Write an enzyme that holds these catalytic residues in place. Structure first.
Site, mmCIF file in Angstrom:
data_model
loop_
_atom_site.group_PDB
_atom_site.id
_atom_site.type_symbol
_atom_site.label_atom_id
_atom_site.label_comp_id
_atom_site.label_asym_id
_atom_site.label_seq_id
_atom_site.Cartn_x
_atom_site.Cartn_y
_atom_site.Cartn_z
ATOM 1 N N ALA A 156 -0.399 9.021 -0.413
ATOM 2 C CA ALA A 156 0.074 10.056 -1.341
ATOM 3 C C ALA A 156 -0.448 11.450 -0.976
ATOM 4 C CB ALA A 156 -0.328 9.705 -2.737
ATOM 5 N N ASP A 171 0.813 -1.183 0.000
ATOM 6 C CA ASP A 171 0.000 0.000 0.000
ATOM 7 C C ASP A 171 0.863 1.256 0.000
ATOM 8 O OD1 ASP A 171 -2.657 1.155 0.028
ATOM 9 O OD2 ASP A 171 -2.164 1.846 2.020
ATOM 10 N N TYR A 183 -4.260 3.228 -9.131
ATOM 11 C CA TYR A 183 -3.543 4.187 -8.284
ATOM 12 C C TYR A 183 -2.108 3.763 -7.957
ATOM 13 C CZ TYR A 183 -3.086 8.150 -5.104
ATOM 14 O OH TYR A 183 -2.725 9.339 -4.515
ATOM 15 N N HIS A 185 -5.922 4.192 6.117
ATOM 16 C CA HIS A 185 -5.103 5.224 5.474
ATOM 17 C C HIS A 185 -3.748 5.478 6.143
ATOM 18 C CE1 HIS A 185 -8.496 5.945 2.807
ATOM 19 N NE2 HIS A 185 -9.261 5.951 3.887
HETATM 20 C C1 LIG Z 1 -9.625 7.519 -0.260
HETATM 21 C C2 LIG Z 1 -8.872 8.810 -0.447
HETATM 22 C C3 LIG Z 1 -7.549 8.791 -0.861
HETATM 23 N N1 LIG Z 1 -6.875 9.944 -1.032
HETATM 24 C C4 LIG Z 1 -5.460 9.925 -1.463
HETATM 25 C C5 LIG Z 1 -4.599 10.166 -0.230
HETATM 26 C C6 LIG Z 1 -4.140 8.776 0.147
HETATM 27 O O1 LIG Z 1 -2.909 8.814 0.852
HETATM 28 C C7 LIG Z 1 -4.019 8.067 -1.193
HETATM 29 C C8 LIG Z 1 -4.047 6.533 -1.100
HETATM 30 O O2 LIG Z 1 -5.325 6.006 -0.757
HETATM 31 P P1 LIG Z 1 -5.551 4.988 0.487
HETATM 32 O O3 LIG Z 1 -5.282 5.775 1.751
HETATM 33 O O4 LIG Z 1 -6.944 4.421 0.321
HETATM 34 O O5 LIG Z 1 -4.607 3.843 0.420
HETATM 35 O O6 LIG Z 1 -5.068 8.642 -1.998
HETATM 36 C C9 LIG Z 1 -7.514 11.192 -0.777
HETATM 37 O O7 LIG Z 1 -6.882 12.266 -0.925
HETATM 38 N N2 LIG Z 1 -8.797 11.248 -0.372
HETATM 39 C C10 LIG Z 1 -9.515 10.127 -0.193
HETATM 40 O O8 LIG Z 1 -10.707 10.194 0.184
HETATM 41 MG MG LIG Z 2 -3.408 3.070 2.518
HETATM 42 MG MG LIG Z 3 -4.297 1.973 -0.842
#
Ligand SMILES: Cc1cn([C@H]2C[C@H](O)[C@@H](COP(=O)(O)O)O2)c(=O)[nH]c1=O
Ligand SMILES: [Mg+2]
Ligand SMILES: [Mg+2]
Ligand SMILES: Cc1cn([C@H]2C[C@H](O)[C@@H](COP(=O)(O)O)O2)c(=O)[nH]c1=O
Ligand SMILES: [Mg+2]
EC number: 3.1.11.2
Lengths: 217, 217
Positions: free
Chosen positions: A13, A10, A121, A178
């Protein structure tokens, strides 16, 4: 079969794909083929969340981005650029590529990265970050697969958020959402549900990481 | 205020020092000093177990030993050479040293390794394992400190097994005992008890790892 190691992956970002984001955190959890298998197929209604296999290689690293995290990005991840910088985190650089290479080289081959929504992603982003480096990509020679595609194929043989899939199987919210390590552990748990069918599907669908198109650049 | 990173360290091994043991698992958890400083100093009797810092780098590896684990060491660690090898684990070798080096290189310096009973076990053993390698020690230039000595200073200012200390502090049994990562997490929690006082003591008492004599030749 033939994939010897699954590497659960994972990333967090700075923002969404449209913002041309940078990695701020990544976790790799390498499990041998056989350790996955030798979970049960988890019995119970609902089954308990399984313990990870005993034998596991894990790497989790925070990475300073060159651009600022979006507002929402910092709220859900709990990371910020300032906080990453003040704690001395280095950028995505050549040294990180060597660390990644040396870690991968410790795993029996072939290796397959496994990530939730990886095809849209994580893999495209990881491909972009590595394409900035002067060193050859450490993920050349490794395979990859999206766990959402896996689970749709296994299931079918409405939300597919990691959280929704986990809570449907286990009847509990996931923890540490996250965070890269948290989300990798959550995905591992989901993939222990039917690990033998999972491995069969992965051996059928694994594709070279080298064929992953970069997100941008 | 001069150690920039504390690296919490635990190893599992094939047995006791008199047997000339080999490392079978190692875990490193790098925490910037600011993350320790800004842990809440514990209050209450017992205080709650502290929340780990958000920004952490973690490395956990299983390592195939050349000689088998004593039956007693397999029982408490849940690891055996048989299982490490059938799961493709590699020896303690040059590539592992390059991996450790790259990981340490991502941490702001000066770095200090922190290990429970490190002076009599973890540090000498690690020094022995690194001496076998053709490639220079990646721990040359890092500091180290035994957390038993640290706690003895902070406490007095009867049992000093990791479990004993944890449960005396938090009135709880530790989890995942005799797993490298589990033990690192337990040590982190104990070191977050009086984090500012612990950092001052480490700064005053840290010694260069290159002064650590090997366990055996
Ligand atoms: C699900 C989501 C992810 N993201 C971006 C920031 C997270 O670090 C990145 C990776 O997604 P994740 O945290 O689901 O693994 O995508 C957002 O900015 N807003 C959101 O609602
Ligand atoms: Mg994550
Ligand atoms: Mg992820
Ligand atoms: C505590 C203990 C450890 N050991 C060995 C096996 C462990 O992997 C190694 C490291 O100790 P640890 O598990 O306390 O961190 O020492 C024994 O052989 N007997 C014992 O009673
Ligand atoms: Mg120990």
């Amino acid at each position: 079969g033939h994939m010897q190691t699954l590497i659960f992956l994972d990333l967090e970002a700075t923002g969404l794909p449209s913002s041309r984001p940078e990695v701020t955190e990544l976790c790799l959890l390498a499990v041998h083929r056989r350790a996955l298998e030798n979970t049960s197929i988890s019995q119970g209604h609902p089954p308990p969340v399984p313990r990870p296999p005993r034998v596991v290689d894990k790497l989790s690293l925070c990475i300073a981005p060159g651009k600022a995290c979006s507002p929402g990005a910092s709220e859900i991840t709990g990371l910020s650029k300032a906080e990453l910088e003040v704690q001395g985190r280095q950028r995505f650089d050549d040294n990180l590529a060597i660390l990644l290479r040396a870690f991968l080289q410790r795993q029996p081959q072939p290796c397959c990265l496994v990530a939730h929504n990886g095809d849209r992603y994580d893999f495209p982003l990881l491909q972009t970050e590595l394409a900035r480096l002067s060193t050859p990509s450490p993920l050349d020679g490794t395979f990859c697969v999206d766990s959402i595609a896996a689970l749709k194929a296994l299931e079918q043989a409405k939300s597919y958020s990691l959280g929704s899939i986990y809570t449907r199987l286990y009847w509990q919210a996931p923890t540490d959402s996250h965070t890269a390590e948290g989300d990798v552990l959550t995905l591992l748990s989901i993939c222990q549900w039917k690990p033998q069918a999972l491995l069969q599907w992965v051996d059928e669908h694994a594709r070279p990481f080298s064929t992953v198109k970069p997100m941008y650049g």
